[PDB]
Amino acid sequence: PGVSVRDVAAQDFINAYASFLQRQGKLEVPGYVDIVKTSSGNEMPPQDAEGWFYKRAASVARHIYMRKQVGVGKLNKLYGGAKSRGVRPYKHIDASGSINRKVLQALEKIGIVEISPKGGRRISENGQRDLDRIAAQTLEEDE
Amino acid sequence: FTPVVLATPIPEEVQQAQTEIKLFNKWSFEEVEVKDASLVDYVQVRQPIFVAHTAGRYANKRFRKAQCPIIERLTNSLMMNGRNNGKKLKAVRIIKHTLDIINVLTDQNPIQVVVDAITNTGPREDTTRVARRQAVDVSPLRRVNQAIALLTIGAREAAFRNIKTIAETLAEELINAAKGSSTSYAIKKKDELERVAKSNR
Amino acid sequence: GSFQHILRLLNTNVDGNIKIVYALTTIKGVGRRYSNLVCKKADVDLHKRAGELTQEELERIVQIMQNPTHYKIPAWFLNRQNDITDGKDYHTLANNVESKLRDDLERLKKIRAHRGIRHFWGLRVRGQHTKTTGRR
Amino acid sequence: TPVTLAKVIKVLGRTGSRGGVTQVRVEFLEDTSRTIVRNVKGPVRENDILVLMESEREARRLR
Amino acid sequence: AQHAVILDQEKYDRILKEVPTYRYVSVSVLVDRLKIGGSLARIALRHLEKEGIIKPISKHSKQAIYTRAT
Amino acid sequence: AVPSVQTFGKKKSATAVAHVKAGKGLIKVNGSPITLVEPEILRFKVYEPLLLVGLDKFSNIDIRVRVTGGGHVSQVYAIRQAIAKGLVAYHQKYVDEQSKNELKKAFTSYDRTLLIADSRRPEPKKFGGKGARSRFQKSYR
RNA sequence: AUCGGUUUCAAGCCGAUGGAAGUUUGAGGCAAUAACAGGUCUGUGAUGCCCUUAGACGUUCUGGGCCGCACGCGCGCUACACUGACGGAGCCAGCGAGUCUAACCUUGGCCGAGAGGUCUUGGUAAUCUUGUGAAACUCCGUCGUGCUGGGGAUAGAGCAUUGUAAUUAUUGCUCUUCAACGAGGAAUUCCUAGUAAGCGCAAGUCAUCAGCUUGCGUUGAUUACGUCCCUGCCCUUUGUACACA
């Protein structure tokens, strides 16, 4: 009866919030989608390419929720993985900026994320409402 | 059996583990016995456990790894060919799979069949380089050590450049070792070490 | 059904087997990234196995491959950009790859540029240490 | 297929170029009072059973 | 092609007779019957699970195991 | 004026601070139920302190675990230990030493890190090697 | 430590129990006498002697070379894949270091597919970078035994950053080109537990450049718990026509 974003599983939540944010045509797509691989250090673009974006959007929503306030730099260095530098040892090069910035702007316009003091971005009260509503449905859909 | 409630709702399959019995969450150590003497007090099937992963201080003194659960000893010996060195989470996930595989075909409770594979793939007389060869008998700890080291090496070598995944290969090898086949880099590889023995035995 | 095998496409044989995004790249001058972007602009289905693409959408695949800039390829997805001849960005996708490779080496050797000379000698041109490497 | 199981009663140093082989004294579980000397390869404690494919032949040090 | 791995709507009919009476079913078995190769083996397993001739015991990604219907 | 004891459990640079209080059954880790720990096989390593004694002993308490440091496996072993040490410290202080004894020899019978941390620590790296032991390759000729 | 063994019941050693800890508790630092014609005069306003002392063998400037390639050798890195690659999501360390009359570590918001730019900001630092939300790893899905999407070398063109200066391509980034390599002969190296191994991270040089080193954690085995067989060690005995042995 007090189901929140934390009480539900990670993937099984993001996949249902992905469905919801795709049913709603509210969240934007920057237009350069289909031509990006969400990194400097990757091989190929996101395999789905049917607006993944609705999975980034969902995960940046869920991440900014659990944290205090997240900036684009924290999202870049979060989502960025190991770059194969050819014959040289693997490194950490952080993920692509524009995707994480334009998804934060898309959440800001929808009313999930709020530009927060101390810099970065917090959740809106409408944000917590929509996240917790989906989080309750996800569990009771199985139950 | 006594479905209790908490402020954190626990699933009933997890709640059927509390002092009921300690399994994987399905494989029981009640036991279909080792059945072959000499290796009893050298295969641990007496202390039941939930996963094939302890922190483990078993390479401490000398004989402490004889009192380690034999499922962990497979899980440990599956991490060789050192692109998989460490990575016990992958190894235990492979072990989970291969056990429920050797359940779905030829069920027999997939711990006693693993135990019986250890009892059959154990080289029971070998030689030593004294360019001569002198046939000697084998310590039951080394009979386990090499029974594991033949099963898990045979498995990876079969699964290498193949579609049959390490889970299915290791599974097939453990089954054909249990029911003496000589078709699993198995009793065949053991007979090859007892053939060079009978030359000098 | 009408499932084809060989699939000839602009002077190459791109076997209509397992996948299309990875079949197109056997053309000398397109790669995994470019093939993917052209398939997306062609609006083909990617789960199909490169043989069940009817000739009309195969023509459209070849259209957007040949003249990419018209169909929203952003002009940093191309081989020759600010080309030395005119200054127009285009993609050398056919046998043009080796044609324009040879043309550039021949341009360098004609000028008698250092990189052109090292290209002529068969030496390594990216100031690499070839004392201990490039034996055979 | 007669294999004879025999428990060890005492271990006697190590034979071989290296300490690869351990000379041990066994008592046959079947028809006991028969004590025989035997070679092993792997690590041997006491009370451990060895499986002989020949009960007959005795054991010598590996010079 | 590559050792009988071709897309077909008749080997659907071959599958739906040959797959039952298997004590064990996975991607590895499907391909080692010189059938459908990998990508097609997995979507065969998924449709056989929807149809209900298959019982899934475990459904881990990279190693999906299945059994004949009781 | 409430039964409350703050305990910790640790495994190789993984500090798991548990707060076992008089409650109903709220067992939670980083403000999420125990049923959602990152490694889904080590779900039964974090859980085993509950399955050892029984959920009936947890029908009158609430536990909140805050995990910091280490990796995924270090943190699971830290939680497991922190919960068991939390529960025995509560029973010692607020029930009796009789039921403390009971569930101590219940916990240590099934083998333990669980109550006291594995002493093991990483050895420092020395020159002319890639670790504490492994020396660089030697070049005679 | 206690108890039991065990050696003339002496120093000790072995087993169990308790304990955070029972190998000198783990790892280092310090580390004798004698010796080498070991290395360094290119670390030293450390220095004898010898050579030059201005058409300089001093140190300054421009450019060039230390990188040059029939070939051989030594430390490495990447790999030959399905215990895998790729895409998404999941998502956790430890030891550092960091600018005032200078340009450091740089949040945060915007521009950008990048790399990287802009306008501010906290930190002379358990206050800020920074939880350095590192990678391997986990889960769901896309590849299905093919030099294949394993591998990423060579090359072509473009966009940036550092720098008086990037050509002999500094580095980074985008697209294209795709080589050898199907686990390696005779040989040889290192390793006994949080060790090997996998994984990345921080520091040194650093304007820029790490496939190096110095450290640190992440994941974490197998196999000995031994013996002189090889290669050497220490003590005693013994033979010697050796003593730069």
UniProtKB/Swiss-Prot annotation, chain A:
Gene Ontology biological-process annotations: ribosomal small subunit assembly; ribosomal small subunit biogenesis; ribosomal subunit export from nucleus; translation
Domain of life: Eukaryota
Keyword terms of this UniProt record: Cytoplasm, Ribonucleoprotein, Ribosomal protein, Ribosome biogenesis
Matches recorded under SUPFAM superfamilies: Winged helix' DNA-binding domain
InterPro entries: Ribosomal_eS19 (IPR001266), Ribosomal_eS19_CS (IPR018277), WH-like_DNA-bd_sf (IPR036388), WH_DNA-bd_sf (IPR036390)
Subcellular location: Cytoplasm
Effect of disrupting the coding gene: Disruption of a single RPS19 gene reduces cell growth; a double disruption is lethal. Depletion experiments show the proteins are required for correct maturation of precursor rRNA to generate the 18S small rRNA. A specific site between the 18S and 5.8S precursors (site A2 in ETS1) is not cleaved in disruption mutants. Partially assembled ribosomes are retained in the nucleolus rather than being exported to the cytoplasm. All effects are exacerbated in the double disruption. Increases association of NOC4 with 20S/21S pre-rRNA, decreases association of ENP1, TSR1 and RIO2 with 20S/21S pre-rRNA.
GO cellular component: cytosol; cytosolic small ribosomal subunit
Documented effect of changing residue 14 to F: Partial loss of function; decreased 18S rRNA, decreases binding to 20S pre-rRNA complex, slow growth in double RPS19A/RPS19B mutant
GO function terms (MF aspect): RNA binding; structural constituent of ribosome
Main location: cytoplasm
General remark: Present with 29000 molecules/cell in log phase SD medium.
From Swiss-Prot, chain D:
GO cellular component: cytosol; cytosolic small ribosomal subunit
GO biological process: maturation of SSU-rRNA; positive regulation of nuclear-transcribed mRNA catabolic process, deadenylation-dependent decay; ribosomal small subunit assembly; ribosomal subunit export from nucleus; translation
Subcellular location: Cytoplasm
Family, as annotated: Belongs to the eukaryotic ribosomal protein eS28 family.
Species classification: Eukaryota, Fungi, Dikarya, Ascomycota, Saccharomycotina
Coiled-coil segments on the chain, per record: none
The protein's role, per its UniProt record: Component of the ribosome, a large ribonucleoprotein complex responsible for the synthesis of proteins in the cell. The small ribosomal subunit (SSU) binds messenger RNAs (mRNAs) and translates the encoded message by selecting cognate aminoacyl-transfer RNA (tRNA) molecules. The large subunit (LSU) contains the ribosomal catalytic site termed the peptidyl transferase center (PTC), which catalyzes the formation of peptide bonds, thereby polymerizing the amino acids delivered by tRNAs into a polypeptide chain.
Keywords per UniProt: Acetylation, Cytoplasm, Ribonucleoprotein, Ribosomal protein
Protein name from the UniProt record: Small ribosomal subunit protein eS28A
Swiss-Prot record, chain E:
Compartment(s) where it occurs, according to its Swiss-Prot or TrEMBL record: Cytoplasm
Disulphides: none
Keywords: Cytoplasm, Methylation, Ribonucleoprotein, Ribosomal protein
First-listed, main subcellular location of the protein, grouped into a coarse class: cytoplasm
CC terms in the record's Gene Ontology section: cytosol; cytosolic small ribosomal subunit
One GO term of the biological process aspect: cytoplasmic translation
Functional summary from the UniProt entry: Component of the ribosome, a large ribonucleoprotein complex responsible for the synthesis of proteins in the cell. The small ribosomal subunit (SSU) binds messenger RNAs (mRNAs) and translates the encoded message by selecting cognate aminoacyl-transfer RNA (tRNA) molecules. The large subunit (LSU) contains the ribosomal catalytic site termed the peptidyl transferase center (PTC), which catalyzes the formation of peptide bonds, thereby polymerizing the amino acids delivered by tRNAs into a polypeptide chain.
Subunit structure: Component of the small ribosomal subunit (SSU). Mature yeast ribosomes consist of a small (40S) and a large (60S) subunit. The 40S small subunit contains 1 molecule of ribosomal RNA (18S rRNA) and 33 different proteins (encoded by 57 genes). The large 60S subunit contains 3 rRNA molecules (25S, 5.8S and 5S rRNA) and 46 different proteins (encoded by 81 genes).
Leftover remarks: It is presumed that the precursor part of S25 is engaged in assembling of the small subunit, thus being essential in ribosome maturation. Present with 322000 molecules/cell in log phase SD medium.
Gene from which the chain derives: RPS25A
Residues of the full protein shown: 36 to 105 of 108
From Swiss-Prot, chain F:
One Pfam family recorded for the sequence: Ribosomal_S9
UniProt region (Disordered), positions on chain: 121-141
Bias-annotated ranges (Basic residues): 132-141
List of residues that carry Phosphothreonine: 68
InterPro entries with a match to the protein in the record: Ribosomal_Su5_D2-typ_SF, Ribosomal_uS9, Ribosomal_uS9_CS, Ribsml_uS5_D2-typ_fold_subgr
GO cellular component, one term: 90S preribosome
Localization of this protein: Cytoplasm
Phosphoserine: residues bearing it: 32, 59, 74
GO MF annotations in UniProt: RNA binding; structural constituent of ribosome
Matching NCBIfam families: PRK00474.1 (NF001749)
Role of this protein: Component of the ribosome, a large ribonucleoprotein complex responsible for the synthesis of proteins in the cell. The small ribosomal subunit (SSU) binds messenger RNAs (mRNAs) and translates the encoded message by selecting cognate aminoacyl-transfer RNA (tRNA) molecules. The large subunit (LSU) contains the ribosomal catalytic site termed the peptidyl transferase center (PTC), which catalyzes the formation of peptide bonds, thereby polymerizing the amino acids delivered by tRNAs into a polypeptide chain.
UniProt subunit comment: Component of the small ribosomal subunit (SSU). Mature yeast ribosomes consist of a small (40S) and a large (60S) subunit. The 40S small subunit contains 1 molecule of ribosomal RNA (18S rRNA) and 33 different proteins (encoded by 57 genes). The large 60S subunit contains 3 rRNA molecules (25S, 5.8S and 5S rRNA) and 46 different proteins (encoded by 81 genes).
Misc remark: Present with 33800 molecules/cell in log phase SD medium. There are 2 genes for uS9 in yeast.
PANTHER family recorded: RIBOSOMAL PROTEIN S16, RIBOSOMAL PROTEIN S9
Name of the gene encoding the protein in the UniProt record: RPS16A
